[PDB]
Design a protein around this motif. Structure first.
Motif, PDB file in Angstrom:
ATOM      1  N   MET A  91      -1.127  24.717  -0.093  1.00 37.94           N
ATOM      2  CA  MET A  91      -1.135  25.266  -1.449  1.00 37.94           C
ATOM      3  C   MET A  91       0.313  25.556  -1.851  1.00 37.94           C
ATOM      4  N   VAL A  92       0.780  24.921  -2.923  1.00 31.60           N
ATOM      5  CA  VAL A  92       2.196  25.041  -3.284  1.00 31.60           C
ATOM      6  C   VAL A  92       2.475  24.944  -4.785  1.00 31.60           C
ATOM      7  N   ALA A  93       3.473  25.701  -5.212  1.00 33.33           N
ATOM      8  CA  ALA A  93       4.028  25.568  -6.545  1.00 33.33           C
ATOM      9  C   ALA A  93       5.519  25.207  -6.427  1.00 33.33           C
ATOM     10  N   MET A  94       5.953  24.150  -7.115  1.00 35.34           N
ATOM     11  CA  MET A  94       7.357  23.756  -7.002  1.00 35.34           C
ATOM     12  C   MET A  94       7.926  23.177  -8.285  1.00 35.34           C
ATOM     13  N   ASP A  95       9.251  23.184  -8.395  1.00 35.31           N
ATOM     14  CA  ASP A  95       9.854  22.705  -9.633  1.00 35.31           C
ATOM     15  C   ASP A  95      10.195  21.216  -9.539  1.00 35.31           C
ATOM     16  N   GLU A  96      10.911  20.691 -10.522  1.00 36.92           N
ATOM     17  CA  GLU A  96      11.125  19.250 -10.574  1.00 36.92           C
ATOM     18  C   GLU A  96      11.948  18.747  -9.377  1.00 36.92           C
ATOM     19  N   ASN A  97      12.671  19.650  -8.715  1.00 35.28           N
ATOM     20  CA  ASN A  97      13.412  19.284  -7.503  1.00 35.28           C
ATOM     21  C   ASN A  97      12.813  19.815  -6.195  1.00 35.28           C
ATOM     22  N   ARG A  98      11.541  20.241  -6.246  1.00 35.68           N
ATOM     23  CA  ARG A  98      10.790  20.775  -5.085  1.00 35.68           C
ATOM     24  C   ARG A  98      11.227  22.169  -4.632  1.00 35.68           C
ATOM     25  N   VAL A  99      11.966  22.869  -5.487  1.00 31.89           N
ATOM     26  CA  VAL A  99      12.317  24.262  -5.221  1.00 31.89           C
ATOM     27  C   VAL A  99      11.042  25.093  -5.071  1.00 31.89           C
ATOM     28  N   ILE A 100      10.977  25.949  -4.053  1.00 27.13           N
ATOM     29  CA  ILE A 100       9.840  26.863  -3.927  1.00 27.13           C
ATOM     30  C   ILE A 100      10.275  28.309  -3.751  1.00 27.13           C
ATOM     31  N   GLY A 101      11.580  28.553  -3.761  1.00 26.28           N
ATOM     32  CA  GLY A 101      12.088  29.889  -3.509  1.00 26.28           C
ATOM     33  C   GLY A 101      13.556  30.093  -3.847  1.00 26.28           C
ATOM     34  N   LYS A 102      13.854  31.277  -4.371  1.00 25.37           N
ATOM     35  CA  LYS A 102      15.222  31.686  -4.649  1.00 25.37           C
ATOM     36  C   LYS A 102      15.394  33.070  -4.071  1.00 25.37           C
ATOM     37  N   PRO A 111      11.280  31.908  -8.588  1.00 26.79           N
ATOM     38  CA  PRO A 111      12.239  31.800  -9.691  1.00 26.79           C
ATOM     39  C   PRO A 111      11.536  31.920 -11.037  1.00 26.79           C
ATOM     40  N   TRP A 112      10.237  31.650 -11.045  1.00 28.47           N
ATOM     41  CA  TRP A 112       9.438  31.737 -12.261  1.00 28.47           C
ATOM     42  C   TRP A 112       8.400  32.852 -12.174  1.00 28.47           C
ATOM     43  N   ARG A 113       7.893  33.262 -13.329  1.00 30.04           N
ATOM     44  CA  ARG A 113       6.781  34.192 -13.376  1.00 30.04           C
ATOM     45  C   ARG A 113       5.677  33.556 -14.214  1.00 30.04           C
ATOM     46  N   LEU A 114       4.689  32.988 -13.535  1.00 29.62           N
ATOM     47  CA  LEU A 114       3.555  32.367 -14.204  1.00 29.62           C
ATOM     48  C   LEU A 114       2.227  33.004 -13.718  1.00 29.62           C
ATOM     49  N   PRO A 115       1.846  34.156 -14.291  1.00 26.96           N
ATOM     50  CA  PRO A 115       0.602  34.848 -13.898  1.00 26.96           C
ATOM     51  C   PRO A 115      -0.627  33.920 -13.834  1.00 26.96           C
ATOM     52  N   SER A 116      -0.731  32.982 -14.776  1.00 24.74           N
ATOM     53  CA  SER A 116      -1.878  32.090 -14.833  1.00 24.74           C
ATOM     54  C   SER A 116      -1.933  31.177 -13.603  1.00 24.74           C
ATOM     55  N   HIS A 118       7.620  21.869 -14.821  1.00 26.12           N
ATOM     56  CA  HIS A 118       8.559  20.936 -15.403  1.00 26.12           C
ATOM     57  C   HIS A 118       9.818  21.661 -15.824  1.00 26.12           C
ATOM     58  N   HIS A 119      10.675  21.894 -14.840  1.00 30.02           N
ATOM     59  CA  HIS A 119      11.907  22.630 -15.067  1.00 30.02           C
ATOM     60  C   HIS A 119      12.782  22.541 -13.816  1.00 30.02           C
ATOM     61  N   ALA A 120      14.063  22.832 -13.997  1.00 30.76           N
ATOM     62  CA  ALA A 120      14.963  22.937 -12.864  1.00 30.76           C
ATOM     63  C   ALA A 120      15.483  24.366 -12.774  1.00 30.76           C
ATOM     64  N   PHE A 121      15.025  25.080 -11.751  1.00 34.87           N
ATOM     65  CA  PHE A 121      15.484  26.431 -11.481  1.00 34.87           C
ATOM     66  C   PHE A 121      16.579  26.387 -10.428  1.00 34.87           C
ATOM     67  N   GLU A 122      17.106  27.558 -10.095  1.00 39.06           N
ATOM     68  CA  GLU A 122      18.084  27.692  -9.029  1.00 39.06           C
ATOM     69  C   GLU A 122      17.354  28.169  -7.782  1.00 39.06           C
ATOM     70  N   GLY A 123      17.407  27.380  -6.715  1.00 36.39           N
ATOM     71  CA  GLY A 123      16.663  27.700  -5.511  1.00 36.39           C
ATOM     72  C   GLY A 123      17.374  27.412  -4.204  1.00 36.39           C
ATOM     73  N   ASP A 124      16.811  27.935  -3.119  1.00 35.50           N
ATOM     74  CA  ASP A 124      17.386  27.776  -1.783  1.00 35.50           C
ATOM     75  C   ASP A 124      16.418  27.218  -0.735  1.00 35.50           C
ATOM     76  N   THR A 125      15.124  27.219  -1.040  1.00 38.81           N
ATOM     77  CA  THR A 125      14.125  26.620  -0.157  1.00 38.81           C
ATOM     78  C   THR A 125      13.328  25.555  -0.920  1.00 38.81           C
ATOM     79  N   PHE A 126      12.829  24.541  -0.213  1.00 39.96           N
ATOM     80  CA  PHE A 126      12.271  23.379  -0.872  1.00 39.96           C
ATOM     81  C   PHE A 126      10.990  22.917  -0.195  1.00 39.96           C
ATOM     82  N   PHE A 127      10.026  22.457  -0.990  1.00 41.75           N
ATOM     83  CA  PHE A 127       8.865  21.821  -0.403  1.00 41.75           C
ATOM     84  C   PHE A 127       9.330  20.496   0.208  1.00 41.75           C
ATOM     85  N   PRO A 128       9.152  20.348   1.532  1.00 40.37           N
ATOM     86  CA  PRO A 128       9.598  19.152   2.252  1.00 40.37           C
ATOM     87  C   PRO A 128       9.135  17.892   1.546  1.00 40.37           C
TER      88      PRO A 128
END
Ligand SMILES: COc1cc(Cc2cnc(N)nc2N)cc(/C=C/C(=O)N2N=Cc3ccccc3[C@@H]2C(C)C)c1OC
Ligand SMILES: [Ca+2]
Ligand SMILES: [Cl-]
Length: 166
Positions: A6-17, A22-27, A118-128
Protein backbone atom coordinates in the motif's frame (compact mmCIF):
# COMPACT_ATOMS: atom_id res chain seq x y z
CA UNK A 1 -1.93 -15.22 1.85
CA UNK A 2 -2.14 -12.10 -0.32
CA UNK A 3 0.92 -9.88 0.21
CA UNK A 4 -0.02 -6.34 -0.88
CA UNK A 5 1.95 -3.09 -1.05
CA UNK A 6 0.00 0.00 0.00
CA UNK A 7 1.69 3.21 -1.16
CA UNK A 8 1.25 6.85 -2.05
CA UNK A 9 3.97 8.49 -4.16
CA UNK A 10 4.67 11.51 -6.32
CA UNK A 11 5.71 11.74 -9.97
CA UNK A 12 9.30 10.82 -8.97
CA UNK A 13 8.31 8.04 -6.48
CA UNK A 14 8.92 10.24 -3.43
CA UNK A 15 7.23 8.76 -0.34
CA UNK A 16 8.81 10.82 2.43
CA UNK A 17 10.42 14.10 3.40
CA UNK A 18 12.25 13.97 6.74
CA UNK A 19 9.97 11.07 7.72
CA UNK A 20 6.79 12.94 6.85
CA UNK A 21 4.19 13.18 4.10
CA UNK A 22 5.13 16.11 1.86
CA UNK A 23 1.42 16.35 1.07
CA UNK A 24 -1.75 16.48 3.14
CA UNK A 25 -4.54 14.58 1.40
CA UNK A 26 -7.15 13.50 4.05
CA UNK A 27 -9.25 11.78 1.35
CA UNK A 28 -6.29 9.60 0.36
CA UNK A 29 -5.93 8.45 3.95
CA UNK A 30 -9.69 7.67 4.11
CA UNK A 31 -8.98 5.45 1.11
CA UNK A 32 -6.15 3.69 2.97
CA UNK A 33 -8.40 3.25 6.02
CA UNK A 34 -11.21 1.83 3.87
CA UNK A 35 -9.03 -0.49 1.81
CA UNK A 36 -7.17 -1.93 4.82
CA UNK A 37 -10.08 -2.33 7.29
CA UNK A 38 -9.68 -5.72 9.01
CA UNK A 39 -6.19 -6.58 7.73
CA UNK A 40 -2.68 -6.35 9.21
CA UNK A 41 -0.76 -3.17 8.45
CA UNK A 42 2.97 -3.90 8.16
CA UNK A 43 5.36 -1.02 8.78
CA UNK A 44 8.93 -0.09 9.71
CA UNK A 45 9.59 1.61 13.07
CA UNK A 46 10.51 4.95 11.41
CA UNK A 47 7.33 4.86 9.36
CA UNK A 48 5.30 4.02 12.49
CA UNK A 49 6.85 6.83 14.53
CA UNK A 50 6.11 9.31 11.70
CA UNK A 51 2.48 8.24 11.77
CA UNK A 52 2.57 8.71 15.54
CA UNK A 53 -0.22 6.42 16.78
CA UNK A 54 -1.75 2.94 16.63
CA UNK A 55 -4.11 3.07 13.65
CA UNK A 56 -7.20 1.26 14.69
CA UNK A 57 -9.50 -1.31 13.29
CA UNK A 58 -6.48 -3.42 12.44
CA UNK A 59 -3.38 -5.25 13.63
CA UNK A 60 -0.51 -2.75 13.56
CA UNK A 61 2.70 -4.80 13.20
CA UNK A 62 5.97 -2.88 13.46
CA UNK A 63 9.06 -4.38 11.87
CA UNK A 64 12.48 -3.72 13.48
CA UNK A 65 15.83 -5.48 14.10
CA UNK A 66 15.54 -4.07 17.62
CA UNK A 67 14.67 -6.86 20.07
CA UNK A 68 13.81 -4.56 22.97
CA UNK A 69 11.40 -2.44 20.96
CA UNK A 70 7.81 -2.47 22.19
CA UNK A 71 4.84 -0.13 21.83
CA UNK A 72 1.46 -0.41 23.50
CA UNK A 73 -1.43 -1.41 21.23
CA UNK A 74 0.93 -2.84 18.62
CA UNK A 75 2.87 -5.97 17.72
CA UNK A 76 6.55 -6.13 16.86
CA UNK A 77 8.26 -8.49 14.44
CA UNK A 78 11.97 -8.77 13.82
CA UNK A 79 12.04 -10.37 10.37
CA UNK A 80 9.88 -11.21 7.36
CA UNK A 81 9.55 -14.81 8.51
CA UNK A 82 8.33 -13.53 11.87
CA UNK A 83 5.65 -11.47 10.09
CA UNK A 84 4.40 -14.41 8.04
CA UNK A 85 4.20 -16.55 11.21
CA UNK A 86 2.23 -13.86 13.01
CA UNK A 87 -0.05 -13.47 9.98
CA UNK A 88 -0.34 -17.19 9.12
CA UNK A 89 -4.17 -17.25 9.19
CA UNK A 90 -4.54 -13.85 7.49
CA UNK A 91 -6.03 -13.65 4.00
CA UNK A 92 -4.32 -10.39 3.04
CA UNK A 93 -1.64 -8.18 4.59
CA UNK A 94 -0.63 -4.64 3.59
CA UNK A 95 2.99 -3.62 3.58
CA UNK A 96 2.67 0.01 4.61
CA UNK A 97 6.18 1.15 3.85
CA UNK A 98 9.56 2.38 4.67
CA UNK A 99 11.39 1.89 1.37
CA UNK A 100 13.46 -0.86 3.06
CA UNK A 101 10.28 -2.63 4.24
CA UNK A 102 8.91 -2.79 0.69
CA UNK A 103 12.28 -4.23 -0.33
CA UNK A 104 12.02 -6.92 2.32
CA UNK A 105 8.61 -8.00 1.05
CA UNK A 106 9.36 -7.61 -2.67
CA UNK A 107 9.94 -11.27 -3.44
CA UNK A 108 6.52 -12.17 -1.97
CA UNK A 109 4.26 -9.35 -3.19
CA UNK A 110 1.13 -10.34 -5.12
CA UNK A 111 -0.82 -7.09 -5.32
CA UNK A 112 0.00 -3.34 -5.63
CA UNK A 113 -2.26 -0.52 -4.39
CA UNK A 114 -0.49 2.61 -5.54
CA UNK A 115 -1.67 6.18 -5.25
CA UNK A 116 0.17 8.42 -7.79
CA UNK A 117 0.11 12.15 -7.03
CA UNK A 118 0.64 14.38 -10.01
CA UNK A 119 3.27 16.67 -8.59
CA UNK A 120 6.94 16.94 -7.73
CA UNK A 121 7.60 17.44 -4.03
CA UNK A 122 10.89 17.59 -2.16
CA UNK A 123 11.72 14.18 -0.72
CA UNK A 124 14.41 11.89 0.69
CA UNK A 125 12.87 8.40 0.50
CA UNK A 126 11.48 6.71 -2.61
CA UNK A 127 9.23 3.84 -3.60
CA UNK A 128 11.75 1.39 -5.13
CA UNK A 129 11.64 0.99 -8.88
CA UNK A 130 9.68 -2.05 -10.07
CA UNK A 131 9.36 -3.72 -13.44
CA UNK A 132 5.69 -3.09 -14.21
CA UNK A 133 5.61 -5.41 -17.22
CA UNK A 134 4.98 -8.31 -14.80
CA UNK A 135 2.04 -6.30 -13.51
CA UNK A 136 -1.43 -5.66 -14.86
CA UNK A 137 -3.76 -2.84 -13.80
CA UNK A 138 -7.16 -4.05 -12.57
CA UNK A 139 -8.68 -0.82 -11.21
CA UNK A 140 -8.11 2.92 -11.38
CA UNK A 141 -9.88 5.97 -9.95
CA UNK A 142 -9.23 9.71 -9.82
CA UNK A 143 -9.03 10.75 -6.18
CA UNK A 144 -11.07 13.62 -4.81
CA UNK A 145 -9.35 16.98 -5.42
CA UNK A 146 -10.62 20.06 -3.46
CA UNK A 147 -9.88 22.66 -0.70
CA UNK A 148 -8.49 20.00 1.67
CA UNK A 149 -6.85 17.79 -0.95
CA UNK A 150 -5.02 20.34 -3.13
CA UNK A 151 -3.24 18.00 -5.56
CA UNK A 152 -4.48 15.78 -8.38
CA UNK A 153 -4.01 12.07 -7.71
CA UNK A 154 -5.17 8.60 -8.76
CA UNK A 155 -5.72 5.27 -7.05
CA UNK A 156 -4.22 2.36 -8.99
CA UNK A 157 -4.31 -1.33 -8.25
CA UNK A 158 -2.14 -3.92 -10.00
CA UNK A 159 -2.03 -7.74 -9.97
CA UNK A 160 0.51 -10.15 -11.46
CA UNK A 161 0.73 -10.31 -15.23
CA UNK A 162 -0.05 -13.92 -16.10
CA UNK A 163 2.42 -15.38 -18.59
CA UNK A 164 1.20 -17.27 -21.68
CA UNK A 165 3.29 -20.40 -22.58
CA UNK A 166 5.17 -20.73 -25.87
C1 LIG B 1 5.02 9.22 6.33
O1 LIG B 1 3.78 9.41 6.96
C2 LIG B 1 2.69 8.61 6.62
C3 LIG B 1 2.86 7.50 5.77
C4 LIG B 1 1.77 6.70 5.42
C5 LIG B 1 1.99 5.49 4.50
C6 LIG B 1 1.02 5.47 3.30
C7 LIG B 1 0.20 6.52 3.05
N1 LIG B 1 -0.66 6.48 2.00
C8 LIG B 1 -0.69 5.37 1.17
N2 LIG B 1 -1.59 5.32 0.04
N3 LIG B 1 0.13 4.32 1.41
C9 LIG B 1 0.98 4.35 2.45
N4 LIG B 1 1.82 3.24 2.68
C10 LIG B 1 0.50 7.00 5.93
C11 LIG B 1 0.33 8.11 6.78
C12 LIG B 1 -1.05 8.45 7.34
C13 LIG B 1 -1.76 7.54 8.12
C14 LIG B 1 -3.02 8.01 8.91
O2 LIG B 1 -2.94 8.95 9.70
N5 LIG B 1 -4.34 7.32 8.70
N6 LIG B 1 -4.44 6.30 7.84
C15 LIG B 1 -5.44 5.46 7.95
C16 LIG B 1 -6.19 5.35 9.25
C17 LIG B 1 -6.82 4.17 9.71
C18 LIG B 1 -7.49 4.16 10.95
C19 LIG B 1 -7.54 5.33 11.73
C20 LIG B 1 -6.91 6.51 11.28
C21 LIG B 1 -6.23 6.52 10.04
C22 LIG B 1 -5.51 7.75 9.42
C23 LIG B 1 -6.44 8.54 8.53
C24 LIG B 1 -7.46 7.61 7.94
C25 LIG B 1 -7.16 9.60 9.34
C26 LIG B 1 1.42 8.90 7.12
O3 LIG B 1 1.24 9.98 7.94
C27 LIG B 1 2.33 10.59 8.48
CA1 LIG C 1 3.19 -14.29 -3.40
CL1 LIG D 1 10.37 2.34 7.99
Amino acid sequence: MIVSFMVAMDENRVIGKDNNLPWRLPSELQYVKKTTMGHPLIMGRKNYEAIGRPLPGRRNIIVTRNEGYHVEGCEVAHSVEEVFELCKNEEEIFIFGGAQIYDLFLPYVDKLYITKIHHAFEGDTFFPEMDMTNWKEVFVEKGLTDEKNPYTYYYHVYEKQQLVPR
